[PDB]
Amino acid sequence: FKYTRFEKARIIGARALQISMGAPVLIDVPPGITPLEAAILEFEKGVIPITVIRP
Amino acid sequence: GYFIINGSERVIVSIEDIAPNRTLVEKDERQEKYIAKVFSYRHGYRALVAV
Amino acid sequence: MKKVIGSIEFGILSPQEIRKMSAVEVTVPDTYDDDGYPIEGGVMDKRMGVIDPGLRCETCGGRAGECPGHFGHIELARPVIHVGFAKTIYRILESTCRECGRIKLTDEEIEEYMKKIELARNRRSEFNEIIKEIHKKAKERMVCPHCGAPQYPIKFEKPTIYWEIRKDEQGNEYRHRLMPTEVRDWLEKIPDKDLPLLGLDPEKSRPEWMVLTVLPVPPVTARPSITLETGIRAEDDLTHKLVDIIRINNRLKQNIEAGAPQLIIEDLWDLLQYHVTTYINNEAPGVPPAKHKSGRPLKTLAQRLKGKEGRFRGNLSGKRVNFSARTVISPDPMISINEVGVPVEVAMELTVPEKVTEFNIERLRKMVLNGPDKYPGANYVIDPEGRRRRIMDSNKETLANQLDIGWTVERHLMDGDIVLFNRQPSLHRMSIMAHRVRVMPYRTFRLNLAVCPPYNADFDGDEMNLHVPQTEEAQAEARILMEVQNHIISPRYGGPIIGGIQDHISGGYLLTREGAYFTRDEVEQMLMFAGVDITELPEPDKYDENGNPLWSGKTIFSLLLPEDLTVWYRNKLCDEPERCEALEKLIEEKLMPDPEEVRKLAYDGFVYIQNGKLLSGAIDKKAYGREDGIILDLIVREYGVERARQFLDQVTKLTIWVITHKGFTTGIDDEDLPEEARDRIREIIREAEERVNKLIEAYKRGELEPLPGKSLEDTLESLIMAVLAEARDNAGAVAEKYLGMDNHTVIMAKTGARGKILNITQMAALLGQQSIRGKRLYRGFRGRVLSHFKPGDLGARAKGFVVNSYKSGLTPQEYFFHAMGGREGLVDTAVRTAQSGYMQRRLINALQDLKVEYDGTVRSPEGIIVQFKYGEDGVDPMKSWRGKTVDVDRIIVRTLLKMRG
Amino acid sequence: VKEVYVNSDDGRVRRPLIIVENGVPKLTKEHVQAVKEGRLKWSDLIKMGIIEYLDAEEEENAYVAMWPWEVTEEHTHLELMPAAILGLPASLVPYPEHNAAPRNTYGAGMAKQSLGLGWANFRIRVDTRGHLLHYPQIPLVNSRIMKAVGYEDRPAGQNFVVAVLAYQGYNMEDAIIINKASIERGLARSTFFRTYEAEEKKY
Amino acid sequence: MIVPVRCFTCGKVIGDKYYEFKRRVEAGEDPEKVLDDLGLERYCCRRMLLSHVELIDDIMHYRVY
Amino acid sequence: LATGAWPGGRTGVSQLLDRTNYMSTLSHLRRVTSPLDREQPHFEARDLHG
Amino acid sequence: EFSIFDHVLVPEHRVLSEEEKKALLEKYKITLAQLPQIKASDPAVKALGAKPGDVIEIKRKSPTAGVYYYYRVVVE
Amino acid sequence: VSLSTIKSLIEKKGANLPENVKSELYEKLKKYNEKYKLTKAEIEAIIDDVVKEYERALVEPGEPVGTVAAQSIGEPSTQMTLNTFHYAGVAEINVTLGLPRIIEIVDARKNPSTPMMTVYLDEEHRYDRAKAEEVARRIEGTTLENLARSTTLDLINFEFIVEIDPERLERSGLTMEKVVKKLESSFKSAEFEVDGYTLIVRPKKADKISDLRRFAEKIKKHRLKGLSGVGKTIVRKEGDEYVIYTEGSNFKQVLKVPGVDPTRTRTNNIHEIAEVLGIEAARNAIIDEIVSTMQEQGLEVDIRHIMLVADMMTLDGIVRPIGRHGVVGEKSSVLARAAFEITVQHLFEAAEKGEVDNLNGVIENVLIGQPVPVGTGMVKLTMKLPLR
Amino acid sequence: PRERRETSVAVRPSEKGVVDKVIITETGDGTKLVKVTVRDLRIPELGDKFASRHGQKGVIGLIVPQEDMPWTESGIVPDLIVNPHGIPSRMTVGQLIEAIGGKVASLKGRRVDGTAFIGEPEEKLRKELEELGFKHTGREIMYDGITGKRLEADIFIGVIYYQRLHHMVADKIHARSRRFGEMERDVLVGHGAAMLLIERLLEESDKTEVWVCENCGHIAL
Ligand SMILES: [Mg+2]
Ligand SMILES: [Zn+2]
Ligand SMILES: [Zn+2]
Ligand SMILES: [Zn+2]
Ligand SMILES: [Zn+2]
């Protein structure tokens, strides 16, 4: 299994939206960063709750 | 050499046109039809006569 | 709770649906009324919805602006033929029996046609062809195969009049008009099983419903009264047509219930039919267009849709989108390739909404304290409920102490934000990319120079647009999908498209040129300028005369390459193939020769890199150029995108530094030729002119052989053009021979940085023949181009052959000929843009729906399979090396070297 | 075809030429001296049959000599000044025969769109928008036609000390690098005008 | 429109030497000798005096109050 | 005379004079135009004639 | 004597049997109407015994993958 | 390592690879093994690396291949020249090049502007210039005008003496008696008093100048020997054999000419290829034509985009123009077609047919206001709620 | 009114300057009329367009302090630096000849005639320049401004007429807070970005919510 770049983009978008809305961050982040790089770091660490469903 | 119209400077650009009252022959390439045409000017009226 | 429309299936409404779907039965032709209030039973009822302010909808109870409107129905007194379905009705009548109503066709024909229709369902054109064939076959028949009853011919009169040509007892043919009730009765008896052959679906479109019995009324929002400048409630054309329809319907009904004669009933029936037809379509064929109160044709339902600016063809458009800016661009190589410089004033307007959380509360607090004037500030703050406020200076001190989780701040642009970048005309995919913001003073969109090729931009007044995505999903899409890093390899040919252009090549050649050495100061300065992380210089190579250490350029360049890169190829400077042959022999013999041996055999025409050390060759276009960037391609495809970006961002600065502090120029003496070369060129020109004159004399005296493709004159012209072109090539060869490599212009041409050899030829030796549309110059006076030549002259000099280079200067006739050539070139450039644009538009409209499914197949929008395993191998052109799926040669060599090292 | 054509109508574009007979041009040294002293005018030269006007039709029978030292017995006319075949803006370019034609066309366009003191009337003139260059200068290398036309009295542009050299990569792809102190001292400084109109319209 | 006070390139003051140069050249002296006498060796300074136009007189006649 | 549009179908006969500088004005006073359609590629008419 | 299949521009054609036809149809989750179509008047069809409603397997010579299979259905 | 072992290892590990990939891998592995004495570990590592690279190079689902192909075809055309040239070669036939050629192929015009056929030779006639000229004569389509050195059309006394050159007669292989016999066998109602090396004609006692002029031009361009619609032929020598280039288009007739190798013979007109060899041949010819046109201008375009375009064009047996005449004009989506037309009858036809719009395109989804089903618009996301 | 409403005339939003002249007068039908002229000082800045007489255009990319400019052994500090790569592809030899001619004219003290074909031949200019004490190729030795060392090559330097066009950046720049087309839509589709297309095109206040029945397929109420 390998994430296509479209799947990765959608996962990052959804995670960033959830973080902005008020969801807790699963990892510690440096202060003064926007939700987007927070989600990017979350993905880079490999800690992602969202999963994709393929036909 | 220009005009003042409502306070704005207007210039008339010369227009290059076909010589009146001269027959010019030419050939098409789909009707294989030799034609000749001439424009006749008479008091500001241009008439296209083609044989 | 929010679903997405997956499909839309079209059909024909049934009268029962129209009855139950509608709410109010409109019966009275009532207008807005004097007090502007909806009259009960009028066209604009309150059950239809309200657009007037200060009242509530009857059905949904919504105020104007929130009530979507609701549908109403009109109960027609007599059946009316729909204008659009008139031709369909006429076709159907000619195909069905007058008595039974079934299709006049044999059962075997029915089976065959059903099979063919099942096969050709998807193809719309073939389906229409089959329908027309069946219609012709049925119409040609005369006796019903089921009943045997005669079928009197049916004649169609536009727009909605049908005549049945019947034969009396005397055999005379008389036209019997079919009333709509007769047509309905005919259509009802048609069974469901016959509909597919007739071209119908017996679940969404039944023939009886084509004839209208109930006419739905659009809601008030669909037919709003736009009012007038005088305050007069300027009504809708649909409203007026509905009023007339209601009046005529009531009149027809009251005369029907009064036992009126058949003639007046027919008159009112035809008036109703005409009004209905003009209401559906005011431009229907054979229909007089109804005039407005001002005498103009009323815009009706048909006209409201088939408009270029209407719902169709109008919603798709290009308008001023929000959060955009446009300004001229200026270059700067001090920023990374994936960065863009934004002026402060632009950054203080294109705000981006950011929701305040726990890990960014203090930054947003400082920003909102800055106000809308200091650069790191904000312009609008949105409370969790939803109201928006302007920060200004009155409440600047507050709105920060009361700012907590759940608020939204529209801060200014800051470094690191993602931003799109566009250049029109937008031809290929790479014309829009995502960059990172870097706010700098002045007012220009600073752009790195390596990114110029994909944008096809030059800094001579070109302008660019940037758009700032607002939502988080859009920002993530731009950051992950659209960044400049991911688009180094072009999808078109599978090679690089981002690389050095002009200085990045020439300066690289200067740095890696054979015999180029640098002192310690220059080495340290250039390494620090390039950003290369180093803390100790390598061992010096060769010592200066007075004792200072020196470093060759090759080692300095090798400090940038990765630690295990290994490649070899031939560049454009290879002029002595024997040395390349010897080097290739050694390399192939060993696959890892001792670097000492390579040093003696070094040659700048043969690049060879061993374990990240440049051992031989010089940098030119083939290293990291616009195309054929062997090293850059290798870095991209083997060490990831980020490593490639770092390598590009370092080599660009290194090369720029070396060319800036080493000196590079060009003067008028760059194209000065020795006397011997000038004499050679002169004698070449004279000999060519003599041969041309000999050809002309041979033609004059009848000594010429006309090849079959051309007449005598055309053969003469072909020979003359060939002779002149060969002469120009010989002169160019001489000039190139006598021009050394140390010349800066020759360096620029040879390395491929800028210009061609033809440019040097034209500037130094000879300009050459001038042609229009591939032919010698001929358009001028009778028998001569200019007036300074004897008439009927075909010599080379007299028909566009110019013998002076740019350095020597052109004589007036040569100047005129050159002007002709340049004008032709400009015209071609002007026209080819439009032609290519038209072709691209056609191709995109044809092909913009295809996509790769999850099983690797490519399917047409209508479901047809276009290609199994896209590309017949499944390889993305971007991922392909240069067209080949896998470059197994490089794989073999790289693996062998890595494991045998 | 044995046809003779005579034209006496409007709109024909003609050019002047020097009549040449028997290999000797009609124009002589004393004529040039008289014109130099102001005793003779262009119309006088026309009326004495020294210079003739030719339209495109009459030029069919002509055989023009480009230069005064190329005239032979076959020639019937001598070109007056071959440098005058160019238009007005195109004559501004110096050494136009050492350039490719597209570059000359571009240069003519830019010369048409450059700033400078166009008219001394600008202070009191009312125009939608205008510009004024602070310190215009005569071109150091300039065609002699420019003085005759009058361009020198209303110049547009300045002379720059230019060095061809790559510098920091900030002038790649047609960009240029300009010296700060020169800008401070007044180089290329200009002013932009705009006029707004308000009318007390009676209704 | 009036003579620049300082040379654009090197900043040398040449504003006061223009009228002297013009009057001397009109008298028939060699322009090169006059420029050398005035003390302008770099051609950057000589260009300012050689290529200047005095348009202030031409534009002085129209007043605006 | 304002807005061009001579009677008889001709349009753009009169244009606003250009006052950008000396050369622009003097060149605009010496312009010659052709009535052909701009869109159609009149290859024979566009090119320079001897 | 000359058959069209010997030409370089003509790849080999073959007629599918019922079992393989249905296996192919099930593999791509499609119906017969969703495949590309070849007319019954095509010379390749005439050279074969193909009849309408049948599936033709085409063995292309691909510049990228060498061998590649394409399928078409026969119509009027 | 015996070559059988390399083949077995290739089949064992790289079973997923395409046939060309594994064949080329086998060839180059054999060469490098015989040159450098590889062992099995290196071979296994190499095959694993090849497999990993091929897996990485696969395209991912959701990629919008159609738009990318359209852009990658359209963009180079802007840099490509725009006709307005007359390449006058000697041993060549004039052929439309560049943008007009691309447009003609894309729009599938019924007859190309410059039809041209490439005819190869069988083994017997391939390796000799003289036999090539003989086959040319069989295919030359020789005309009296080409044979004639010059023509004298003297209407003042009702005759027509055309001067025939001996060299052209010898090249065509026809003799004066032979050509006169063929002409009279064709022009039965004429009298040919041929003398020497000149033809003499009379139009059965005509009266007016125009009649004899028309009769003379009728004979002048009349065909004598050769297949219909064929002009000049230029027998060249490419590689080692002689190949006969030829104008005109008679692709079905030429295949029956003796000495002509029919397997390699090609023609410019794609429609003729469709008629004679089938539809797959038409697709391959389209691909080759576009590739050659792109190559002559120096531009490089990946073969995959051209393959996609060609496959899309010949989707239903008959070659159709890709434009609105044959492809866009038959778009299934009634909404997409709606913003391309001037009438509304298409809506009524769709409603009558019960057409279902699948919203599988781009324009319809854009108009509605919904994510386009390409790329990120294809994926669906789910999450297990209990979170740390 | 169509109380009274304001119809005052105000300057354009993206302009500034100083009022220079105000005149009051009467129209042709007796109504009062005023005109106001606003002047603005525009010092050159990044993005301003410059072009020579030989069709060589460009915008200034950097304003460098004087001490960083390289100087010449004769003391000449260039006022403008152009890239050598622009010459070979354009073949504007007239530019180089004009540079030499300007140098010669400045040194000699009289202007140089460049009247097309009868102008001063370039070889005469080169000879005169050589006689005046400079290299006949127009090249000079220059020192680097930053390092202070001597540049390795000899740099061509001269005087060239330059004109400033009115395409100035202060008039081009404008940004909208609260252009696109079909080609951009195709590009965005080609990238695979869909939510970006929705955000950039649809935006907000033009989309609405509609209840839909899942049984029949009609708009629910
Ligand atoms: Mg540009
Ligand atoms: Zn409501
Ligand atoms: Zn019946
Ligand atoms: Zn100075
Ligand atoms: Zn329902």
Question: Is some CB atom of chain H closer than 8 A to the CB atom of C132?
Answer: no
C-alpha angle with apex C778: C773 to C784, nearest 5 degrees? 170
CA of C71, nearest ligand number: 2
Listed in sequence order, the residues at least 6 apart from E29 whose beta carbon sits closer than 8 Å to its beta carbon are none
Listed in sequence order, the residues at least 6 apart from D117 whose beta carbon sits closer than 8 Å to its beta carbon are D132, D133, D136, D154, D155, D156, E1, E55, E59, F21
Nearest Cα of chain H lies from the Cα of G5 at a distance, in angstroms, of 9
Nearest Cα of chain I lies from the Cα of A14 at a distance, in angstroms, of 12
* Cα–Cα distances in angstroms (integers) from residue H292 to residues C426, C603, E47, G11, H319, in the given order: 27, 36, 59, 21, 20
DSSP string, H254-301: HTTSTTEEEEEEEES-HHHHHHHH-HHHHHHHHHHHHHHHHHHTT---
Technique employed here was: cryo-EM
Listed in sequence order, the residues at least 6 apart from G47 whose beta carbon sits closer than 8 Å to its beta carbon are G3, G4, G5, G13
A55 DSSP 8-state letter: -
Cβ within 8 Å, pair E43-I103: yes
Question: Around Cβ H147, how many Cβ atoms within 10 Å?
Answer: 21
C-alpha D66 chain-centroid distance:
20
Alpha-carbon gap, residue H197 to H165, rounded angstroms: 8
Question: Is some CB atom of chain C closer than 8 A to the CB atom of D175?
Answer: yes
**Helix C812-847 and helix H303-313, axial crossing angle in degrees, nearest 10:** 60
Amino acid at C403: L
Question: Around Cβ E58, how many Cβ atoms within 10 Å?
Answer: 15
Cβ within 8 Å, pair C709-H324: no
Question: Around Cβ B36, how many Cβ atoms within 10 Å?
Answer: 12
Alpha-carbon gap, residue H342 to H364, rounded angstroms: 18
Nearest Cα of chain C lies from the Cα of I198 at a distance, in angstroms, of 9
- The pairing of strands D77-78 and D64-65 is parallel
Active-site positions of D?
174
Alpha-carbon gap, residue C164 to C156, rounded angstroms: 9
Q: Do chains A and C touch (3 or more CB pairs under 8 A)?
A: yes
CB nearest C812 (choices: I99, I117, I182): I117
Cβ within 8 Å, pair D150-F19: no
Reading the block at residue I178, the tokens are 């609260």
> Three-class SS of residue C501?
coil
Q: H234-237 — which CB contacts under 8 Å span 24+ positions?
A: H234/C709, H234/H91, H234/H92, H234/H93, H235/H129, H235/H132, H235/H133, H235/H136, H236/H91, H237/H129
**Helix C262-280 and helix C237-257, axial crossing angle in degrees, nearest 10:** 160
Cβ within 8 Å, pair C482-I183: no
Nearest CA to C900 among C612, C564, C609, C555? C564
Q: CA C844, C846, C851, C852: dihedral to nearest 10 degrees? A: -120
Q: In what order do the strands lie in the sheet with H198-200?
A: H148-152, H161-164, H198-200
D100's enclosing H/E stretch is none
> Three-class SS of residue C157?
strand
Alpha-carbon gap, residue H112 to B16, rounded angstroms: 38
Three-state SS for C107-120 is: HHHHHHHHHHHHHC
CB H91 within 8 A of CB C841: no
Reading the block at residue C205, the tokens are 């479109």
Reading the block at residue C421, the tokens are 């970048």
Let me know if H110 is exposed, middle or buried by CB neighbors in 10 A (0-12, 13-18, 19+).
exposed
DSSP string, C618-641: ---HHHHSSS--HHHHHHHHHHHH
* Cα–Cα distances in angstroms (integers) from residue C548 to residues C517, C544, C750, in the given order: 12, 5, 33
Beta partners for residue H30, in sequence order: none
CB nearest C405 (choices: A22, A31, A34): A22
Nearest Cα of chain A lies from the Cα of H385 at a distance, in angstroms, of 8
Alpha-carbon gap, residue C386 to C165, rounded angstroms: 72
Question: Is some CB atom of chain D closer than 8 A to the CB atom of C825?
Answer: yes
Alpha-carbon gap, residue C405 to D103, rounded angstroms: 62
CB H178 within 8 A of CB H210: no
Question: Around Cβ H288, how many Cβ atoms within 10 Å?
Answer: 15
Amino acid at C665: T
Alpha-carbon gap, residue I92 to C806, rounded angstroms: 8
I59's enclosing H/E stretch is strand I57-64
Question: Is some CB atom of chain B closer than 8 A to the CB atom of F10?
Answer: yes
Reading the block at residue I21, the tokens are 């002249």
Reading the block at residue C516, the tokens are 């180029």
Alpha-carbon gap, residue H376 to C372, rounded angstroms: 36
Nearest CA to H327 among H342, H339, H337? H337
Ligand 1 center to C460 CA (angstroms): 5
For residue E58, the chain D residues in CB contact (below 8 A) are 120, 153
Residue with tokens 């709410």: C23
Listed in sequence order, the residues at least 6 apart from F48 whose beta carbon sits closer than 8 Å to its beta carbon are C816, C819, C820, C823
Answer positive or negative: Cα dihedral of C366, C367, C372, C378: negative
Alpha-carbon gap, residue C444 to F26, rounded angstroms: 34
Resolution of this entry, Å: 3.2
* Cα–Cα distances in angstroms (integers) from residue H270 to residues C138, C231, G43, H96, H318, in the given order: 38, 67, 15, 15, 11
CB nearest C820 (choices: F41, F43, F48): F48
Nearest Cα of chain E lies from the Cα of I99 at a distance, in angstroms, of 13
Q: H126-133 — which CB contacts under 8 Å span 24+ positions?
A: H126/H241, H126/H242, H126/H261, H127/H240, H127/H241, H127/H242, H128/H242, H129/H235, H129/H237, H129/H242, H131/H259, H132/H235, H132/H242, H132/H244, H133/H171, H133/H235
Residue with tokens 């959608």: A10
Counting as contact any 3 or more CB pairs under 8 A, the partners of F are: B, C, D
Cβ within 8 Å, pair B15-F1: no
Reading the block at residue H12, the tokens are 């064992």
C-alpha angle with apex H238: H233 to H241, nearest 5 degrees? 90
CB C324 within 8 A of CB C463: no
Beta partners for residue C438, in sequence order: C341
Ligand 4 center to E9 CA (angstroms): 5
Establish, for the pair of chains D and E, how many residue pairs have beta carbons separated by less than 8 Å.
54
CA of I78, nearest ligand number: 4
Q: In what order do the strands lie in the sheet with C567-570?
A: C567-570, C606-610, C613-616
In H314-344, alpha helices (H): 334-338
Let me know if C542 is exposed, middle or buried by CB neighbors in 10 A (0-12, 13-18, 19+).
exposed
Listed in sequence order, the residues at least 6 apart from C263 whose beta carbon sits closer than 8 Å to its beta carbon are none
Alpha-carbon gap, residue C638 to C890, rounded angstroms: 11
Buried/exposed code over D126-165 (b: 16+ C-beta within 10 A; e: otherwise): ebeebbbbbbbbbbbbbbbbbeebebeebbbbbbbbbbbb
Residue with tokens 């040294």: D29
For residue H63, the chain I residues in CB contact (below 8 A) are 192
Preceding peptide of G11 cis, ω within 30°:
no
- The pairing of strands C858-859 and D15-21 is unpaired
For chain I, give the number of residues.
221
Residue with tokens 């050394």: C740
Q: Identify the residue among D124, D141, D159, D189 best suited for mutation to test binding to E, counting E beta carbons within 10 A and taking the highest.
A: D159
Alpha-carbon gap, residue C566 to H197, rounded angstroms: 75
C-alpha F44 chain-centroid distance:
19
**Helix I93-108 and helix E43-50, axial crossing angle in degrees, nearest 10:** 90
Ligand 1 center to C461 CA (angstroms): 6
Residue with tokens 């078409």: G72
Preceding peptide of G36 cis, ω within 30°:
no
Ligand 2 center to C60 CA (angstroms): 4
Question: Around Cβ D45, how many Cβ atoms within 10 Å?
Answer: 18
Amino acid at H53: E
Q: CA G58, G60, G65, G71: dihedral to nearest 10 degrees? A: -30
Instruction: Find the closest chain E residue to I105 by CA distance.
Output: E47
* Cα–Cα distances in angstroms (integers) from residue C729 to residues C687, C688, C735, D129, in the given order: 14, 12, 10, 53
For chain A, give the number of residues.
55
C446 DSSP 8-state letter: E
Listed in sequence order, the residues at least 6 apart from C764 whose beta carbon sits closer than 8 Å to its beta carbon are C671, C673, C735, C739, C805, C807
CA of C459, nearest ligand number: 1
Gyration radius from chain E CA atoms: 13
Reading the block at residue C254, the tokens are 């009251």
Alpha-carbon gap, residue C41 to D110, rounded angstroms: 71
